[PDB]
């Protein structure tokens, strides 16, 4: 199953404790949230509690080499948990199939569906049941009162890959507290603008998120989480002008601002 174009939510994944295995190869489990991925894949299969370590790369076994093989550069996570009452009734479950024989080893991320007759010896058996050839697919027997290592376990493997496509899956969107009437920087999904956010008196139609002016400048953006209209204004800029009494007359000067609004006198021509 391929999962993409959605906000990743691993919070409920580690805030649950019903699972038995939370080993994340390649990438550390402590920082999934601040990582953006392109494609997310999730496999699912049921295996006995004995053959759970064989899912890890490097190990070898019947399941690890004939049914499911993982690459040595795996950068994902493996989730396993125990479900005995759901997967087995009082009589046991016999609809689950697995492989014990194959012509050779299996490459990673490769599955096989063919159910031919496995050949072990040199003399062919002409495609019928007999000696030196058997049926490589085998049914499995479950018990309700069996051992803890022989109860059914559900294993789900998560795979994360990076391609040239833009990231379609990122960690939960972070929404900081809104601060107004201060020279701050905001990024409302379309622009990295720096300025104040005053309270406007103009209503916006209920389909718009942006807004421009006569001079074609984005100066009005709607906040999405509370539906208020906030204006964008540059903080302040100007020049430092000085007045001088002259030479051989004085030594002190005064700082004059062109249009910056604030001994100190508030003149019409600035500060």
């Amino acid at each position: 199953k391929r999962i993409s174009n959605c906000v990743a939510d691993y919070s409920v994944l580690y805030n649950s404790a019903s699972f038995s295995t939370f080993k994340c190869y390649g990438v550390s489990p402590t920082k999934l949230n601040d990582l953006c991925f392109t494609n997310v894949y999730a496999d699912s299969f049921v295996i006995r509690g004995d053959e759970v370590r064989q899912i890890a790369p490097g190990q070898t076994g019947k399941i690890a080499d004939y049914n499911y093989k993982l690459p040595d550069d795996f950068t994902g996570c493996v989730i396993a948990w125990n479900s005995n009452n759901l997967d087995s009734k009082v009589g046991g479950n016999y609809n689950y199939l697995y492989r014990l024989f194959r012509k050779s080893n299996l490459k990673p991320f490769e599955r096989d569906i063919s159910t031919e007759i496995y050949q072990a010896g040199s003399t062919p058996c002409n495609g019928v049941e007999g000696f030196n050839c058997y049926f490589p697919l085998q049914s499995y027997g479950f018990q309700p009162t069996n051992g803890v290592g022989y109860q059914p376990y559900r294993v789900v493997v998560l795979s994360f890959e990076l391609l040239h496509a833009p990231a379609t899956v990122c960690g939960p969107k972070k929404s900081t507290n809104l601060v107004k009437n201060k020279c701050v920087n905001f990024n409302f999904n379309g622009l990295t603008g720096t300025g104040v956010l005053t309270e406007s008196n103009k209503k916006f139609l209920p389909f718009q998120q942006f807004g421009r002016d006569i001079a074609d400048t984005t100066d009005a953006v709607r906040d999405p989480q509370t539906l208020e209209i906030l204006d964008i204004t540059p903080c302040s800029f100007g020049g430092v002008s000085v007045i001088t009494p002259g030479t051989n007359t004085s030594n002190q000067v005064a700082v004059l601002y062109q249009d910056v609004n604030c001994n100190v006198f508030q003149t019409r021509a600035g500060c």
Partner: antibody
Amino acid sequence: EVQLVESGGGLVQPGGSLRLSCAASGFTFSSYWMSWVRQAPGKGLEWVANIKQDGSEKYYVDSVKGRFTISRDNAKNSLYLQMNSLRAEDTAVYYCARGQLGPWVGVDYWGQGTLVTVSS
Amino acid sequence: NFMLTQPHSVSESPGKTVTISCTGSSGSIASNYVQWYQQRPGSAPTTVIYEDNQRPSGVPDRFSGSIDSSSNSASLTISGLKTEDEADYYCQSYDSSNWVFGGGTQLTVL
């Protein structure tokens, strides 16, 4: 800087009822795992309890099963631990443990603790 | 019946690399994460190992750890062996909805 105080001990009782409290500050109490852990004087470490960040799921060791209870709230940022039917083995120093993501990351958070001894 | 086996007095050496081994019995310790905890004698405990490969901020890089699967054991290696190392170590794992702690390995004479 995460700040922890524990003050629930200081008295002896055989088989009675006792209350220990751990108060935490400097973080969000409603998002991370919490646990309770004790050690005997002169002995090694052992695990006591854990609780989910909303208090929905709680678990114990089989030695204290049947007794013991734990509860939490997010309004005043404190952990509640209540005990009953104490024994002589309960002479231990209790630390309130704080988790990060789950029971696999590790404890990583150890309070100063309160000396708790029992007598008959 | 998951339990972790480790010594009680090791690393009694000055100024060279030594290793401490903690091994599991009931199950494979490589399935889940194992951690090492360093506690001050008579004071609050701390942690030297989390995630089985990384370090807390401020902890020196002298310590190092490794995992082998042939023995089902956890190896923690100490390089500097400075005057700060006076503590006892524990190894903690997780089998199923429960936590298990190690016996403890006292290290005093460095």
